[PDB]
Write a protein that binds this DNA or RNA. Structure first.
Lengths: 192, 78, 176
RNA sequence: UGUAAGUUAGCAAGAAAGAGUAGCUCUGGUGAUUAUCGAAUCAGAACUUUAAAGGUUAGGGG
RNA sequence: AAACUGCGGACGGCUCAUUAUAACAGUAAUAGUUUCUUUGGUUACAAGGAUAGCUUUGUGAAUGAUAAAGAUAAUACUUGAGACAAUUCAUUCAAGUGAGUUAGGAUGCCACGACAAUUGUAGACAAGUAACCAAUGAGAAUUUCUGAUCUAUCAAUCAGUUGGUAGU
RNA sequence: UUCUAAGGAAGGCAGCAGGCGCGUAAAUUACCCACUUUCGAAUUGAAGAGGUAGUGACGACACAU
């Protein structure tokens, strides 16, 4: 099968490399699994030394961390909008590390309502700051100091926030990501 | 501003946010990470003050310097 | 004769090659066989072999068809052999409750030669050693509970006996 | 992609020889004016089928 | 005795075809990986099915060939109280080492999840088991520097080829 | 390459002995786990590893006439 040895390559001088042995299991490679988007489907791979790798063939949900608010919420994945390596990965909705995806910010908005008493999905969000169990007014003044990037708010109101997958679904069998923020969101939004 | 010339976003291996003057984490900036390599080598000023991003730089990444150490003269810079 | 209803459950080809339930043809085919379906018995662990088998559809080439039973099929009967050994199996076949003893009903067989009423070895009863199996093996978590476990916090207290003492910028703490 | 003997070194040479080509849905490269506007051309990827220059025009080769 | 289960047949034994910086020798790294075995440690008065040897019916010329039915065990296959451990990701406080946002701690989250529902009446004490650390391990595997016979009637070679970014 | 009932089937001595061929050119179809040691559920069982014997003017040492 696929091999990862360097005996089949050429030297840095361009000279061909001759053969002394045959293929061996130490340099064994495995067929890639392109984790698409859909119904959950994972497989167990017996790796070397008996350890087990979780090969995620298809996934739909994932846990995403909001860095600023210090929470992590499970969420359904909607679409893959930008893959920095191959444009084919955008159409096929292949889940890989560093793939900018879109998820519905329902639990994050719900968490924000309970934790804060306001709703990001409100188009009058900044106006609702000026206009006011009853101790939520103490928390109310945190936003008159800290602000969100505009592109995040548009995703909240449109129901599609941008997140970056930060795990290896073909190795760990799961999608772990994080919501993009100030400097990263501007860069990745101009790409789209 | 000038180092983001690739398709992906360029970040250091250890990118961390610095605290605000009020004493809490400010998520609006990233600390420029730089370390000191070992056996009597000084870290250049550009590794401290510069804004370049490199994941293989011995001063701004997690690549270590191991036992073998040689000297030579530059041949090509292409 | 009158005839009953029968379901075909096996059979062999004219050449002794068996028939596979999954195989849905008439002629003979060759499959990569392991011991899961049966028609091949492996020697090594995880060893497969390409053997030839027959299809599930009956045809004229079949020499024997398993579709000779417990003491002479026609109209007959006789049975027994190898009663239960697990204690929980003893209760169910003899209408025995949970509390009542079973050894008054355990199957016994005689021996006749040139004597002995042998019996199986009961498994998972409430018998003396087996009742106390806890206190013999399953209790005595001392290896983890009383000797271990508390030793963590028993020996964790060392974080203050001389650990913080040394942390006071002194030279060396005496044992006493 | 590959191309011999021979040679007046210019040629032989379209040598010989092999592969690809359709439809549909997309992706990317090549500019102008300072976000708007415009050109046919090239490259690539999934899917489908009756597997694609051949209706017409259109070298047999050594 | 046979049979299930466990372990081993990846060691040893033979040969030198391949192999021209390939392999090998000395050296150095693994802060770029790591098992097995062995050794130190750390974390319900007991449940559920079916399977061989066994018995019975057989086929084929035949293989270390094989088909049906009837039962029966587990330290085989499962569930289940007994109360953490190690995985991924995000954020953060940071002490040995030449050198590490490093061993480690904290927060939030997902997956995984126990210390046999085990065995000696005799040689209370053994014995067995699951994960997680450390040693075995200057081991295994990759990799660093230097070192190979003849040949110019072999002078130019290379297109994954050389480097970068993201991934697999 | 071998068995075959002609329907089909297994096998890989560059393992220890041994045979054919090849060449100027190279030994027994032996005995045993008693030494060294490996494996195993283990103080015991196996081991053509290993040991002993057989052929041996490749060689090396001492020694008759």
């Amino acid at each position: 099968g696929i091999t990862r040895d360097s005996r089949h390559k050429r030297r840095a001088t361009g000279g061909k490399k001759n053969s002394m042995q045959k293929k061996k299991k130490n340099t064994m490679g495995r067929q890639p699994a392109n984790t698409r988007l859909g119904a959950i489907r994972v497989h167990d791979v017996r790796c070397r030394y008996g350890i087990i790798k979780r090969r995620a063939l298809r996934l739909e949900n994932g846990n995403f961390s909001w860095a600023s608010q210090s929470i992590t919420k499970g969420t359904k994945i909607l679409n893959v909008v930008y893959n920095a390596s191959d444009n084919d990965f955008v159409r096929t909705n292949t889940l890989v590390k560093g793939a900018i995806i879109e998820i519905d910010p329902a639990p994050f908005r719900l968490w924000f309502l309970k934790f804060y008493g306001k709703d990001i999905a409100s188009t009058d969000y900044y106006k609702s700051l000026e206009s006011a169990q009853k101790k939520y007014a103490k928390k109310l003044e945190v936003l008159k100091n800290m602000k969100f990037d505009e592109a995040l708010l548009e995703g909240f109101q449109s129901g599609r926030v941008l997140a970056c997958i930060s795990s290896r679904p073909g190795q760990t069998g799961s999608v772990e990501g994080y919501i993009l923020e100030g400097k990263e969101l501007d860069f990745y939004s101009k790409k789209i | 501003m000038a180092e983001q010339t690739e398709r992906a976003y360029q970040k250091q291996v250890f990118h961390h946010h610095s605290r605000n003057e009020k004493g809490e984490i400010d998520f609006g900036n990233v600390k420029r990470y730089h370390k000191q390599i070992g056996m009597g080598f000084v870290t250049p000023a550009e590794a401290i003050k510069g804004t370049y991003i490199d994941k293989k730089c011995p001063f701004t990444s997690d690549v270590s310097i191991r036992g073998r150490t040689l000297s030579g003269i530059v041949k090509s810079c292409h | 004769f009158k005839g009953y209803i029968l379901k075909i459950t096996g059979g062999c080809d004219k050449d002794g090659f068996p028939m596979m339930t999954g195989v849905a043809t008439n002629n003979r085919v060759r499959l990569l066989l392991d011991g899961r379906n049966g028609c091949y018995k492996p020697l090594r662990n995880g060893e497969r072999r390409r053997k030839t088998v027959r299809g599930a559809i009956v045809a004229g080439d079949i020499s024997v068809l398993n579709t000779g039973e417990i003491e002479g099929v026609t109209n007959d009967a006789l049975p027994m052999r190898a009663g239960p050994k697990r204690a929980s199996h003893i209760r169910k076949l003899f209408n025995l409750s949970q509390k009542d003893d079973v050894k008054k009903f355990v199957i016994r067989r005689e021996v006749a030669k040139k004597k002995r009423s042998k019996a199986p070895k009961i498994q998972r009863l409430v018998t003396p050693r087996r009742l106390q199996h806890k206190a013999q093996k399953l209790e005595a978590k001392k290896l983890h509970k009383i000797a271990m476990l508390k030793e963590a916090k028993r020996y964790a207290a060392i974080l203050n006996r001389y650990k913080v003492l040394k942390a006071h910028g002194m030279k060396v703490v005496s044992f006493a």
